[PDB]
Design a protein around this nucleic acid. Structure first.
Ligand SMILES: [Mg+2]
Ligand SMILES: [Mg+2]
Ligand SMILES: [Zn+2]
Ligand SMILES: [Zn+2]
Ligand SMILES: [Zn+2]
Lengths: 276, 327, 259, 276, 259, 327
DNA sequence: ACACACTTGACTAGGGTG
DNA sequence: ACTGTGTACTAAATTTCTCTCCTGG
DNA sequence: CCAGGAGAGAAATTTAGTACACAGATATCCACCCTAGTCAAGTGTGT
DNA sequence: ACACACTTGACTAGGGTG
DNA sequence: ACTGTGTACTAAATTTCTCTCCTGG
DNA sequence: CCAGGAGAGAAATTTAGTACACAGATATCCACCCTAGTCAAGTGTGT
């Protein structure tokens, strides 16, 4: 068809086809079977997963480690935050050992609270064997995010930014005072003297009172039906879409696609593009 | 036996009312314990159902819930002790509390179902010796008294009765503190000038109370009461002068030194206008209690040359205390 | 677990049956590892420095203990100058809570002008204890001795553990899993019970609400909202709008009407 | 006091002030007298000056030079665009010396049409004295952009993206065809066969027909009144805000301003944190 | 400018007074530099390949010329296989316009299926000439000889030029700055006069509009919009809505209602 | 003298009407040229003012603008020539065109101000020899004819008058092509079945026109007319059979070979239903014009064994042309 | 009874994720 | 003396129509 | 007996509203932890 | 006629923007 | 088996009030 | 003679709606063009 093979020779927009003289609906059909004309435009209409975690109870925590103040002393800090009530515990000095991470977690438990889940990045100080041996010694689960995906920990990443630029404020002023206490102070602030939205409580007091409340429940996930869809390797190797044939096992926000290595992988929907 | 489905409040008032069988649980559970656990699971469903929806709480159940309450715990206690059946009474409680502060509780309806002899059949439970229920009972009373008016002043009189009957003799009521807190919540919620009734019943029984002994078990909260009493009512401070002083103890004891610790933590809201007439009767005991038989009065009677403004008061208007303060 | 949670922390007799052990399963747990200035509610504090039996070097640790509840927060240092006591307090104050009447003996670390130049900056009445006033020792030392015991009950076993986790764990147990009197309240529970709201007279009501909130975005579509009715929960995060499905959810939310 | 200077010791939020018992708006005054709190929080509420030129009937070209995928060899494409009708002319083969850029302009002018202004970035092949002498020999103006600011050329930078992903489409299919005539192809389907936008007129037509129209008038850049702004060096040196005192010659969008070198640049407003 | 524009461009006698020179000064420009099958309305084409004076190696001018207007589009290359006779055509089509009848000659570069394997893929009737039909030569050759003489007019002066600019410039002058006959139209403006709209009977109305629509953002504020007003102009970019100040602007617009 | 300010259309109708002084500009501009340039600047302002606003074009000016038009150019021309005062007439034109297609021109008002003798005092201007004005005059007539109905059919008759008077004798009208285009715009805008009047006036004068000579100056456009004529009206092709054939030229000339080039570019819409009766009278000249005195007819008369469907027609229904096509 | 048939080991190298 | 922007992609409005089949002319 | 006609698809077809990415480009280093191979000290045979 | 005063240059060196 | 988010910053609504000073008790 | 009361600031004070950036980090190379100095062929002094 002078309409159809015209697109099959130029890849012109549907409106041009219309003006060539074929009705819109057939145009729209054409523009969803020009497989190349589909594999190149990156346009990404899948629905966002804003789903960092559900928080029916308190105590599903989150971990992350950060580098501060490398004027002369790189200043490594560890932070754990709670995601029912946005309360932050933070301990630095320099190191990276598993034994250091462990001593930090063990210290955050003396502050509040005593969690029941956990999840961090892929890990190394967290991937240690003795680390998870400490975990299991405390009857705690543990999970890891997908590799190479920073937004996965959106919450912590933001609470980091909040903490740094409060430190920076203090250190613009009063530029002598030692970090040990200019940190203890910036914490007492973040916990006791701020409010968030019309929630209009101080993170801490919100973290304290409402546990007097019960726990709703939604379980028995179901309704699994596959689909088929070409997008993209998630190694930041941004390029044309990367087409896979199709999902081995559906999920909620994520997916599971056999890379040609016949290997399972869990791509998040922020990287996919649906097909027939 | 269980459910969640026709969505008929009648089938749910059934689920509620069908707990109408009652266990005698002194020492004999052997007979079909299963009715017991199923009851527990029943009320569990009932509670989170009430958290579930909005339209659940219509009239036909109101006198039934209050009856189910009364039938479930309105009975005597043996005059540090806890409950065997505790998580059961701890659930009828939590269910009722959440029932009370539920949004869809209209007071104008329940007004006829809230009863004065009922609340008397509630307050006498504070005499028990389980602290746990003595907490749920605290909070629930605080909700009733916050959510009604006639019974508000009524219970005020009822407790003044208890007060009288308690202070004048040796009642080991052992459940006082929980009202001293409901008191403090009240005495905060005032706006003077007002009726003297309150302050009157305070100068009537509240301060004479200190004739009592064993004060450690109710001292802090009563101190927090007297301070919530003063602010702003505190101008009502002029007549407080010498009250404890005449109620001052006689013998040597850490009771007296605790009461000193009190008196030390109460000289905070002085204002020099009426303070003319009081600094002298103050020192007529304070400077004159060196004759106490303690070994501590050697530095007890001299803890007031050391403040910021108490000292400045000693240098503010010293035109009358100057020879009495020992040079 | 309870035999293991014991060997993990070495509690006693009382606070274990509340995890699932019977009466005798608590006394037999004791048979396991055998023989191993008023009340001032809230925030009128007290504190102290202490030596400590070394591992090979005497660790000097300060501490701050409340007087109303009986909580504890403390740390360990090597030097004990005023800059140290300062950093210690300031940490405890980022722990709970923020006081208004602090008391101590008259050691040199309590004299220095910098210390004053910090207390004054926080509206904190700093009094002076009478030095060598042990009429308050039986209670402060009740606490301190607790720590001393617990620590030795820790590193008499597996002594290779570092000399800080012993402190962390020591606290986490001493402030979440104990009651001494019949109060049936942990120190740290009690110390943060949200205070009872004082009732106002002649307006016997309450205000607990925010009405709709047009809601959308349960799932996977952008469209008009749904009329979002009340919210019976709230938290950084979401708000529990009860869906018309007679069911509940959690969403980061759209509108804010008046209520 | 405790209301007043508390911010001067913690830098807590205004809400925390009022809730500890301070006033209602003098809070807002306090939170604009912490030079620290301003030198640290980032925000650009200054309006989105967003504007090209183009009022003329299609006579400001605005054209830049770029790269291309290597089958086994780089391919340099120069591309000039118009700014009133989005028409694109593009000539590539390998070299980006001045003399070739010149021969490109000299060709992309035959294809419509002889301009009256021109605009570009600081690329060397354009800073050439020889290019400049050619330009002047042809009675044209010439201008640059503030250096180190890619958005400045938004229009052409985008028409680049458009041209690349059209090429890629073709070279997905039929991957043998010579890498030049498939350019003449794309250039057709970009100018004649593709309805632009809501205007609904193919660029080509929009570029020819309306020349019958007159020229409206607008003039008098005037009414100068300075201000002070502390914001950020524009050398990608993202950091705390960089504070100067104050503009010498304000202008539309941009703003002349001296750095401490007693030297004067024109920081695009998009990097200025207003403070008077 | 006219003496330099002259030597830079340097076509001829007619189309120069429209830049500012008078009658005699135009003839005194000629005195200057001492060196100077039907008619087939738009898109029924014709083309040809041509040799050229070897500067030292002859190049293969390869050209296409319309028959209605008389425009030109050509290029330079070395070989003459259908590979690039194609690439030449295809480029001319990216230039203007897209034809429907291509008649050049019976050359092998036209014989090859590679050629027809492209033409057929574009729905392009291929009608080719009777070879050796010079009854059309006096005209296509009029064009070609123009190209020839213009090139030598360029580089006989300043032979330092490469043989690309010489062609680019040769065109830009031959197709924007000339008028053939009294028509007083350039080859270009003629070849792209937007055709007169054919008039309907009994529908004797018109549609020149897009409905009013709100507007904001002249300057520096975010708020509700204003107007609406009709918009009397439009272009990729902005749309020239007449602002309420009795004046005009250009904004990248907001709404598109029905009219 | 100039302005833009009271914003009163009366002061602007003044600015308009004050051009009522008229220059005699044959050879004598010496007397105060400045009135001339100021006029040009005036109308420039007037034009962009009309582009400026919406409410500018109210009634009180309509017969004035049309009068200012008539007074400015309604005069005789000397029967390749251009205008000395050209950019002045080129501006009264562009101003009027933009005035015409202005949005706020209501036809129901101007209906009485549009006049039949007026438009006759417009069409006779096409006889001139300036191509430039012959363009503005083209487009403006196309706007009138698109924007009115009575004058629409009226001018149709007027031009048929011109047609008659032109074709039947040697009128060197030299301005025809511009109407042939307005024609093509019309003949496109039709919907048959309809009144035969149009096609009648075509078989009356349009094809007999070819008796004329010098055809090159209007040949293309007329060819485009006849094709716009046929499509789809082309089934109306049955009667076109032999028309040019009888109007076929007689002598030897590139006129005839141009007409061959035409006839070659018109065999495009054949349909075999009526094509039965015509392929023979076609070949009764086409196959029978070898007797022409050209040296070209040797390959002229045989350009039809070479098409795609013309050849398939020679092999479609050849049951009647088979012996006539020379073997 | 010591030379070899047999092990660890330590200790690199290399890879992978932030 | 200088300043972001144009297209793709999918749900939702909205606007044609369209037989079902009711109605009394 | 049937022309306008609710009307439930329906189909069709317009519009609205967000996302994305063009920008000069890669290699190289670093803090850490795990698995796999490579010489370097230790113990049982035969008469 | 073989001792020194005068340019480029070539030809290095270095920097700045994409 | 697994998934972005919280604060800052300014214009605009909107809601207190508020003296001006009019009105008929 | 003055209490409710339009009402024009007004002031005050709430709300709404976008932008920004946390993510492991730098050095090094490359295509080009300009400015500044350094001996090295070429040419001017003194007889
Ligand atoms: Mg990390
Ligand atoms: Mg560039
Ligand atoms: Zn395509
Ligand atoms: Zn033990
Ligand atoms: Zn500040």
């Amino acid at each position: 068809p002078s309409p159809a093979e015209l697109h099959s020779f130029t890849h012109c927009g549907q409106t041009a086809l219309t003006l060539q003289g074929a009705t819109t609906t057939e145009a729209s059909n054409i523009l969803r079977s020009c497989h190349a004309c589909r594999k190149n435009n990156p346009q990404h209409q899948m629905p966002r997963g804003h789903i960092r975690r559900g928080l029916l109870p308190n105590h599903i925590w989150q971990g992350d480690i950060t580098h501060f103040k490398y004027k002369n002393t790189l200043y490594r800090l560890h932070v754990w935050v709670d995601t029912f009530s946005g309360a932050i515990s933070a301990t630095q000095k320099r190191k990276e050992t598993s034994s250091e991470a462990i001593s930090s977690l063990l210290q955050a438990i003396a502050y509040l609270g005593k969690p029941s889940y956990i999840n961090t990045d892929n890990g190394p100080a967290y991937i240690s064997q003795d680390f998870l041996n400490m975990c299991t010694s405390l009857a705690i689960r543990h999970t890891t995010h997908v590799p190479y995906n920073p937004t996965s920990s959106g919450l912590v990443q933001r609470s980091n930014g909040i903490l740094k630029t409060l430190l920076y404020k203090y250190f613009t002023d009063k530029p002598d005072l030692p970090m040990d206490n200019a940190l203890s102070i910036a914490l007492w602030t973040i916990n006791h003297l701020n409010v968030l939205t019309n929630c209009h409580k101080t993170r801490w007091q919100l973290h304290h009172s409402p546990r007097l409340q019960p726990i709703p429940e939604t379980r028995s996930l179901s309704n699994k039906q596959t689909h088929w869809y070409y997008f993209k390797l998630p190694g930041l190797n941004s390029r044309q879409w990367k087409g896979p044939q199709e999902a081995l096992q559906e999920a909620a926000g994520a997916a599971l696609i056999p890379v040609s290595a016949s290997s399972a992988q869990w791509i998040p929907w922020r990287l996919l593009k649906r097909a027939a | 036996i269980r459910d969640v489905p026709a969505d008929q409040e009648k089938l749910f008032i059934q689920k509620l009312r069908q707990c109408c069988v009652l266990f005698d649980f002194v020492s004999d559970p052997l007979s079909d314990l299963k009715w017991k656990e199923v009851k527990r699971a029943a009320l569990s469903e009932m509670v989170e159902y009430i958290t579930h929806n909005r339209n659940v709480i219509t009239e036909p159940i109101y006198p039934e819930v209050v009856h189910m309450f009364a039938v479930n715990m309105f009975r005597t206690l043996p005059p540090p002790t806890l409950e065997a059946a505790w998580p059961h009474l701890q659930l009828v409680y939590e269910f009722f509390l959440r029932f009370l502060e539920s949004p869809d509780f209209q007071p104008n309806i329940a007004k006829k179902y809230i009863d004065q002899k009922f609340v008397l059949q509630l307050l006498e439970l504070f005499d028990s010796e389980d602290p746990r229920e003595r907490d749920f009972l605290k909070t629930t009373l605080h909700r009733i008294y916050g959510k009604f008016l006639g019974l508000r002043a009524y219970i005020r009189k009822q407790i003044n009765n208890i007060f009288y009957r308690f202070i004048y003799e040796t009642e080991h009521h052992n459940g006082i503190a929980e009202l001293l807190e409901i008191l403090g919540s009240i005495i905060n919620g005032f706006a003077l000038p007002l009726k003297e009734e309150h302050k009157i019943f305070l100068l009537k029984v509240l301060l004479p109370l200190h004739k009592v002994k064993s004060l450690s078990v109710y001292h802090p909260q009563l101190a927090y009461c007297v301070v919530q009493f003063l602010e702003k009512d505190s101008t009502l401070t002029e007549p407080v002068v010498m009250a404890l002083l005449k109620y001052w103890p006689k013998t040597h004891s850490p009771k007296e030194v605790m009461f000193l610790n009190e008196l030390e933590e109460i000289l905070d809201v002085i204002e020099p206008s009426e303070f003319v007439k009081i600094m002298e009767p103050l020192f007529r005991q304070l400077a004159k209690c060196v004759s106490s038989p303690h070994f501590q009065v050697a530095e007890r009677a001299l803890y007031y040359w050391n403040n910021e403004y108490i000292m400045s008061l000693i240098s503010d208007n010293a035109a009358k205390i100057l020879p009495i303060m020992f040079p």
